[PDB]
Amino acid sequence: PRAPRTYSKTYSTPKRPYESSRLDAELKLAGEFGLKNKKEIYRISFQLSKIRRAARDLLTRDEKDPKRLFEGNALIRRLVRVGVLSEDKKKLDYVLALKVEDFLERRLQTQVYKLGLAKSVHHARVLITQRHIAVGKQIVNIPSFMVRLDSEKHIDFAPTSPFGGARPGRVARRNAA
Amino acid sequence: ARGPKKHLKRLAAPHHWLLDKLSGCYAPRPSAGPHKLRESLPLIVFLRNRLKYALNGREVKAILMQRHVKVDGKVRTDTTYPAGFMDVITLDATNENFRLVYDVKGRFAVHRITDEEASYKLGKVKKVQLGKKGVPYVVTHDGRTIRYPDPNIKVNDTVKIDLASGKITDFIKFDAGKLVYVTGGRNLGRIGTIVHKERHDGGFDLVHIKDSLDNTFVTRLNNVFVIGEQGKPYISLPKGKGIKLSIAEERDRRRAQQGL
RNA sequence: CUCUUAAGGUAGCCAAAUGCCUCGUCAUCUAAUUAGUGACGCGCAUGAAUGGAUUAACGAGAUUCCCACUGUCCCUAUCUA
RNA sequence: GCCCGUCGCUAGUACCGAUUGAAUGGCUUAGUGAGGCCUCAGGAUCUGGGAGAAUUUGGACAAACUUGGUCAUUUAGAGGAACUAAAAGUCGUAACAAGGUUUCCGUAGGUGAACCUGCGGAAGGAUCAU
RNA sequence: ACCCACUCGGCACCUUACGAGAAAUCAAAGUCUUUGGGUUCUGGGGGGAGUAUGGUCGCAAGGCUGAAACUUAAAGGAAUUG
RNA sequence: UAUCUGGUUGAUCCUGCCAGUAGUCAUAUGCUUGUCUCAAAGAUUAAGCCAUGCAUGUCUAAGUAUAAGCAAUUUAUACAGUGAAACUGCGAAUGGCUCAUUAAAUCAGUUAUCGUUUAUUUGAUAGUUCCUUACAUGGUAUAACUGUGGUAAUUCUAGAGCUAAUACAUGCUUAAAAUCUCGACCCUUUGGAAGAGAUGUAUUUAUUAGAUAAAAAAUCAAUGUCUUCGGACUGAUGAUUCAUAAUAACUUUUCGAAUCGCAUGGCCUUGUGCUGGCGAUGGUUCAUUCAAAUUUCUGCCCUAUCAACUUUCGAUGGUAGGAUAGUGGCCUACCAUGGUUUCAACGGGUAACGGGGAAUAAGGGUUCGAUUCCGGAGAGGGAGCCUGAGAAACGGCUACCACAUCCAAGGAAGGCAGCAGGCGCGCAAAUUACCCAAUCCUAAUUCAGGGAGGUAGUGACAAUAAAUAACGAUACAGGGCGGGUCUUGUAAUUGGAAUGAGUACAAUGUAAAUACCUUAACGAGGAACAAUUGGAGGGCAAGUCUGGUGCCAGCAGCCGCGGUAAUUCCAGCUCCAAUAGCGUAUAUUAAAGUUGUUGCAGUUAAAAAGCUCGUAGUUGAACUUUGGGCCCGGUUGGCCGUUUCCAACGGGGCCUUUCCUUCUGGCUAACCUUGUGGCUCUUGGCGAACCAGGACUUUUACUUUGAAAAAAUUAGAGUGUUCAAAGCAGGCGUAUUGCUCGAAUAUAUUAGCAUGGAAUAAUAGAAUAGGACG
Ligand SMILES: [Mg+2]
Ligand SMILES: [Mg+2]
Ligand SMILES: [Mg+2]
Ligand SMILES: [Mg+2]
Ligand SMILES: [Mg+2]
Ligand SMILES: [Mg+2]
Ligand SMILES: [Mg+2]
Ligand SMILES: [Mg+2]
Ligand SMILES: [Mg+2]
Ligand SMILES: [Mg+2]
Ligand SMILES: [Mg+2]
Ligand SMILES: [Mg+2]
Ligand SMILES: [Mg+2]
Ligand SMILES: [Mg+2]
Ligand SMILES: [Mg+2]
Ligand SMILES: [Mg+2]
Ligand SMILES: [Mg+2]
Ligand SMILES: [Mg+2]
Ligand SMILES: [Mg+2]
Ligand SMILES: [Mg+2]
Ligand SMILES: [Mg+2]
Ligand SMILES: [Mg+2]
Ligand SMILES: [Mg+2]
Ligand SMILES: [Mg+2]
Ligand SMILES: [Mg+2]
Ligand SMILES: [Mg+2]
Ligand SMILES: [Mg+2]
Ligand SMILES: [Mg+2]
Ligand SMILES: [Mg+2]
Ligand SMILES: [Mg+2]
Ligand SMILES: [Mg+2]
Ligand SMILES: [Mg+2]
Ligand SMILES: [Mg+2]
Ligand SMILES: [Mg+2]
Ligand SMILES: [Mg+2]
Ligand SMILES: [Mg+2]
Ligand SMILES: [Mg+2]
Ligand SMILES: [Mg+2]
Ligand SMILES: [Mg+2]
Ligand SMILES: [Mg+2]
Ligand SMILES: [Mg+2]
Ligand SMILES: [Mg+2]
Ligand SMILES: [Mg+2]
Ligand SMILES: [Mg+2]
Ligand SMILES: [Mg+2]
Ligand SMILES: [Mg+2]
Ligand SMILES: [Mg+2]
Ligand SMILES: [Mg+2]
Ligand SMILES: [Mg+2]
Ligand SMILES: [Mg+2]
Ligand SMILES: [Mg+2]
Ligand SMILES: [Mg+2]
Ligand SMILES: [Mg+2]
Ligand SMILES: [Mg+2]
Ligand SMILES: [Mg+2]
Ligand SMILES: [Mg+2]
Ligand SMILES: [Mg+2]
Ligand SMILES: [Mg+2]
Ligand SMILES: [Mg+2]
Ligand SMILES: [Mg+2]
Ligand SMILES: [Mg+2]
Ligand SMILES: [Mg+2]
Ligand SMILES: [Mg+2]
Ligand SMILES: [Mg+2]
Ligand SMILES: [Mg+2]
Ligand SMILES: [Mg+2]
Ligand SMILES: [Mg+2]
Ligand SMILES: [Mg+2]
Ligand SMILES: [Mg+2]
Ligand SMILES: [Mg+2]
Ligand SMILES: [Mg+2]
């Protein structure tokens, strides 16, 4: 009777499970952008392989086939609108080539670091969670925002966060009492 | 299976009613009436979903029981009444009137119309034959029988309906070059006015249509609804007059209205 | 290995109408079977035209069980000549 | 060195097998036949030729019970006969070296056991050759 | 009858290897990952086992058809060195 | 998103399997478990059995109220408000559950009714009812009720006394008109008449009309309007016996309002006269809509250790009937001997409901679908049936079988594959809770009812987001270029910061709660708010550390480890992988080109029948309008910033001896038509462009495009759910009384339909001419 609540998975999994070449490599990415799960990496490989064998499929169509452009130009719009594809690259032969790290450097937990304002890449992840920084009045506690380079302009802290103008905060207030 | 089904699950509901899946389990099963079940729309969705006058279903019943609503003239208090294409819904409060007319996306659109226009009607005649005592009658897409029409009305033609009373006065004909309205398939919504009609004795005569953008298409004759003369209709078409904007056409103009 | 023979019972088959022991042992049929049947075999003392083994068909032949049937019986009673 | 078979131990699997063996389902002959329905009657009454209960005739439909048959799916069994684990132990030496009678195939008979012998083949021979 | 030359169709041999193959070797076993001329048949690890079971042919011996349970990490091929 | 790796050997290359590996809307179990969202869940085994409670009832101004009912008000002395009980009506055939049976059945896509039923909704439709008489309105016979009773016992009911109707059962009515039938008289002719009845709809039958391929005459039997007395004189379909109508009758004669509510008014010739408003229930017949029932074409899994099957006792057809709502061997009677099959019939199997779909990502495939949506089947097993529009119903009845409860032993009652809960079965699956607030549904109906449905609980089924920490200062130390001033940081004292997990005023949330969102007060330093699960010889990432054991115990998916220094066991330590999760078993997909159409292998590794014939099946050489010319205008891109100029890529039509079926008119859009860049313009003259009627057509396969096409699923656009899985929203002002975009697109592909193409591959054609045009 119920209508079926749709779901899906967000992470693939390496077939060879112990390729230490790719396993060190995986961790360098992990301990760089501040990730907890190697499946935060496996996750963002997944969409990439989707974008690719979405995109790779379009360059088979006869050049400028009706739908190849509609969702072609729909695709490259989506990725510059988050700023992973750079503005030179909006004719979609180069979207096949989005090496993974581009996606990670466009996180929230990442740019909150590259804007200064994160002493470490992990001071980032720790304050995002804790009622700290926002974009509008809209607090965000998801270190995987994928900020869209438009709203990257306003990433100052929140008004209720006692690091960007607030009341003292919970344990300060009786360190002083 | 032991007689009449009287329930309608969701996702059995007609898509063009645009109900969200999770609001329960069921759509409102339209009642029996003028319009085919799958080819109609009930009052409770009109007053609740597309037009958002009422919040819940319980309210829609409260609304109708005050004789507020009229369709084609009459009080018509059936919460699930099968109101269909080309009906008129006068609304006593607000002095609003709506003719029921498709988009070119094929759904039922909200379309306010004049008080003058709110008192005539058309119908694709679906049958014509003699009857009791030999008085001929026409019957049309909407479920009414007009006794004593002219011998010149054959079948497949539209008819003006006074609907303060019964009779017809004018009857547009089905010939090469009359304004048509596709009322099925999903060329549903597109418009205009002939190319020609392939006979195909045995069934399923094919109707060729040329929209007023020099774009052809074909649909079956059962689903072509002549509505008059080139560019000269006999009712008020809705916005964009059904000329099947492309996906890129539609989103090029989608971003044409770009600056606030 | 050994004594010994003319040769030392092969293929087959069995408590077989051939087995003492013996109402053999195991199974089977039964409530219960010195019965029957199927198995077993150092078989007192099975065995090859002393013919061996197997066999459809046949039998007023010996034997076991089932169905039907019944005064054979429980348990006797009555009639006719 | 390798290695074959009978023979003996332990364990497991499946097979054959007296029990005219057992069990579960699907049909189904023949026999008996509930019930409601249709129908011939009936006439407690209850009425203006009608009604109508009990009862009843004959039907089609047909559960079901008794005894069979058939199909499918299972399955107990004295005992018999395989295989395996399995490499070993007993007896021998079959094959592998011309394996000490070259080997193998088909067929036939014989032998504790591998095996032996006859007839015709093959070389994968131990001979690409007068 | 013999000699010489050519040409059809035979039984084979020889030299090559373009080519093939795991190799031994192969004018097919070639013209296959640059994979498609037509068509028939069989095989899918080794044992179990061509056993069991049914069907069928036979006078018989046996022929054709022909499983599974279980067991097992090999068994096999060609070549190299000992 | 096109990958391999470990194991045959002394070493080698193979064939080959085993093991490894990864996924699973895939079940289970094990260890571990904090937050948000999401939210499947007694399918598998046993469609096995069920205690108890609940899951279907329903009233409007408008069928029935003398409750000895409450309430009194209020014009109301018939009724009137309110209304239990009860009748009447309607519903109970939807829903929800389960997957047992079912293999040409269901189902799917595509059809058919000119092959039928159709409550309801919606739209139409009724001057006729009598007779050679209540219409100011006709009849009892009953519930409730009262009262007397029975029984251990039930939604048991008996005897008696009342009374209602939109229940039951009856039974009047209305204009004109015309057409048919009889026809007393009169009067004989060319012949006509007074008035007598008949003629609603529905049923049954027979007869007729229902035209139409282009035009005309003569006559026999009747016999219609006008005499200038010779005489003259129209529906639909491709398609019907269709719609409709006419005639003679037929009928235990259908319907044709004895109903109800709100108002009450006109109009005298003042009659209890005559009239008349709005809307409710009904009522035939037609149409509509919701349906149903059959039905066309094509498509199912394994099986030949199933080859013949179908008529006993219908098998295949014919005729006639019967029965049905209707077609039909559905059934019967008579007659015939047919029907299916290697192009796999028939039988068997199925741990089989079908589908939408799910899993697995080079592709081609392989596997799965009890399970939210559609269809079907069932309600312990059968069969039978009442009611009804609709049921072969089971929260209906009846019978049998099985199960099974109560008892006073006489009898009575039960059907969870509804909700929950219980027993059983098993590897295997949750509360005997809350609400009609939403979603919808039903009733007499805005109100009542709804275990449909939604709420919470249970809930590591799956799915998403992602806490268990974050910055210092210092101190020996490295290293930058003696430690100096740049941190690599390893530090076993420190340090002030931050926060939800939790807790909790509060508001929010909600039907009432609960959580979540928001938020005072609390709420973190190692004792913590303390992460797990596996593993560390190889495949395979991480130690030949230490202790134990001594072929023991144990490990080891596989190769292999342990018999006294164990890289493998039991541990301590350290280390790796994944991480709120991770291991194990079973299945399954990838890897697997080990099922091979794509795409395998067959000399010796597994595998060419000893041999040839040979039916089925598969396959099968070549050759029939090619080539040339005129034209039209399309779509990219170029030089220019679309007219014309260049290339190239496609569409059509022409003429080249050149069906394009074909005419009979209707049509003509086009020209041979009447300074050629440019086009209006009637008076001779294009065909096929297709209407619609006629006549007549060799059969296919393939490919194009298109229609028909359910949602959810999938692919995918838009949208910043705080992110994400999702959802189908949302976004703007004048946020004082509105503005506005949406809710795409794609996808079906086998079969059917429609359409363009004429290569490729078939079929057919003139040879005894029984040929072709006329
Ligand atoms: Mg409804
Ligand atoms: Mg012997
Ligand atoms: Mg004896
Ligand atoms: Mg004894
Ligand atoms: Mg005995
Ligand atoms: Mg005896
Ligand atoms: Mg004996
Ligand atoms: Mg003996
Ligand atoms: Mg003795
Ligand atoms: Mg003797
Ligand atoms: Mg003797
Ligand atoms: Mg003899
Ligand atoms: Mg014999
Ligand atoms: Mg005898
Ligand atoms: Mg005897
Ligand atoms: Mg017996
Ligand atoms: Mg009868
Ligand atoms: Mg065996
Ligand atoms: Mg030897
Ligand atoms: Mg030797
Ligand atoms: Mg020898
Ligand atoms: Mg040799
Ligand atoms: Mg030669
Ligand atoms: Mg070579
Ligand atoms: Mg070579
Ligand atoms: Mg024989
Ligand atoms: Mg080894
Ligand atoms: Mg080795
Ligand atoms: Mg060696
Ligand atoms: Mg494996
Ligand atoms: Mg069950
Ligand atoms: Mg279930
Ligand atoms: Mg049950
Ligand atoms: Mg009263
Ligand atoms: Mg149902
Ligand atoms: Mg059916
Ligand atoms: Mg009476
Ligand atoms: Mg006509
Ligand atoms: Mg008729
Ligand atoms: Mg009056
Ligand atoms: Mg069999
Ligand atoms: Mg017949
Ligand atoms: Mg016959
Ligand atoms: Mg076959
Ligand atoms: Mg089944
Ligand atoms: Mg696929
Ligand atoms: Mg496979
Ligand atoms: Mg299903
Ligand atoms: Mg299935
Ligand atoms: Mg099942
Ligand atoms: Mg039933
Ligand atoms: Mg029930
Ligand atoms: Mg039911
Ligand atoms: Mg008693
Ligand atoms: Mg239950
Ligand atoms: Mg579970
Ligand atoms: Mg519930
Ligand atoms: Mg519920
Ligand atoms: Mg913790
Ligand atoms: Mg702490
Ligand atoms: Mg550990
Ligand atoms: Mg390693
Ligand atoms: Mg250890
Ligand atoms: Mg894993
Ligand atoms: Mg192919
Ligand atoms: Mg192979
Ligand atoms: Mg060999
Ligand atoms: Mg051969
Ligand atoms: Mg043969
Ligand atoms: Mg050819
Ligand atoms: Mg299409």
B112 touches strand F (CB under 7 A): no
Residue A9 domain flag: no
Token digits for A73?
């130009």
CATH superfamily of B121-171: Ribosomal protein S4, central domain (2.40.50.740)
How far apart are alpha carbons B146 and B129 in whole angstroms? 11
Q: Smallest CA–C1' separation from B29: which nucleotide?
A: F440
Give the distance from CA B230 to its chain's centroid: 20
Q: Which residues pair with B128 in a beta bridge?
A: B138
Resolution of this entry, Å: 2.9
Residue A7 domain flag: no
CB B141 within 8 A of CB B225: yes
How far apart are alpha carbons B8 and A174 in whole angstroms? 62
Farthest-apart Cα atoms in chain A, separation: 74
Look at the domain B1-116 and name its fold: 3.10.290
Name residues whose C-beta falls within 8 Å of residue A69's C-beta, 6 or more positions apart in sequence. Answer: B248
Residues with CB under 5 A from ligand 1 (ion): B 29, 80
Residue A8 domain flag: no
Q: How many residues does chain B have?
A: 260
Which DSSP letter does residue A34 get?
A: T
Looking at the 3D structure of chain A, how many domains does it have?
A: 1
What's phi and psi for B165, nearest 5 deg?
Answer: -130, -175
Which DSSP letter does residue B233 get?
A: E
* Residue written as token pair 């609907």: B163
Structural domain span for residue A123: 17-177
Token digits for B36?
């085919």
Q: Smallest CA–C1' separation from B218: which nucleotide?
A: F707
Pick from B217, B150, B231, B143: which is nearest to B184 by CA?
A: B217
Pick from B140, B31, B50: which is nearest to B89 by CA?
A: B50
CB B233 within 8 A of CB B227: yes
Closest CA–CA distance from residue A68 to any residue of chain B (Å): 11
Domain spans of chain B, in order of start: 1-116, 121-171, 174-244
Pick from B53, B51, B45: which is nearest to B79 by CA?
A: B45
Q: How many residues does chain A have?
A: 177
* Residue written as token pair 């309205």: B181
What's phi and psi for A39, nearest 5 deg?
Answer: -85, -10
139-158 on A, CB < 7 Å from strand F: 139-146, 148, 150-151
How far, in Å, are A127, A174, B27, B79, B236 from residue B30 at the CA level? 55, 66, 9, 9, 26
How far apart are alpha carbons B163 and A20 in whole angstroms? 82
* Residue written as token pair 């506690």: A141
B215 touches strand F (CB under 7 A): no
Pick from A177, A135, A143: which is nearest to A161 by CA?
A: A135
CB B31 within 8 A of CB B42: yes
* Structural Rg of chain B based on CA atoms: 19
How far away, in angstroms, is B42 Cα from ligand 22 center? 96
Q: Which residues pair with B41 in a beta bridge?
A: B83
Pick from B12, B8, B234, B13: which is nearest to B113 by CA?
A: B234
* Residue written as token pair 């689903």: B223
Q: Is the dihedral of CA B33, B36, B37, B43 positive or negative?
A: negative
Q: What is the assigned CATH class of domain B174-244?
A: mainly beta
Token digits for B246?
């492309």
Token digits for B142?
């909407």
Q: Which residues pair with B26 in a beta bridge?
A: B9
Instruction: Give chain F positions with protein CB within 7 A.
Output: 1, 3, 21-25, 38-40, 92-97, 111-112, 119-125, 202, 235-238, 243-245, 285-293, 361, 372-377, 389-394, 437-442, 446-447, 452-454, 462-472, 496-500, 519-524, 540-542, 576-580, 690-692, 706-718, 720, 722-729, 732-733, 741-746, 753-755
Token digits for A108?
């929230």
3-state percent breakdown (helix, strand, coil) of chain A, nearest 5: 45, 0, 55
135-164 on B, CB < 7 Å from strand F: 137, 139, 143-145, 147, 151, 154-155
Q: B174: helix, coil or strand? A: coil
Residue A4 domain flag: no
How far, in Å, are A93, A113, A149, B21 from residue A89 at the CA level? 8, 26, 16, 39
Count Cα atoms within 13 angstroms, Cβ side, for B181.
29
Pick from B14, B146, B171: which is nearest to B84 by CA?
A: B14
**B206-211 contacts at long range (C-beta below 8 A, 24 or more positions apart):** B207/B180, B209/B180, B209/B182, B211/B242, B211/B243, B211/B244
Which DSSP letter does residue B110 get?
A: P
Helical ranges in chain B per DSSP H? 43-45, 57-64, 247-254
The burial class, CB within 10 Å (0-12 / 13-18 / 19+), for A54 is: middle
CB A43 within 8 A of CB A104: no
How far, in Å, are A49, A74, A77 from residue A57 at the CA level? 12, 15, 17
CA of B149 to C1' of F669 (A): 37
How far, in Å, are B6, B44, B75, B81 from residue B3 at the CA level? 10, 25, 30, 21
84-113 on A, CB < 7 Å from strand F: none
Give the distance from CA A30 to its chain's centroid: 13
CB A38 within 8 A of CB A26: yes
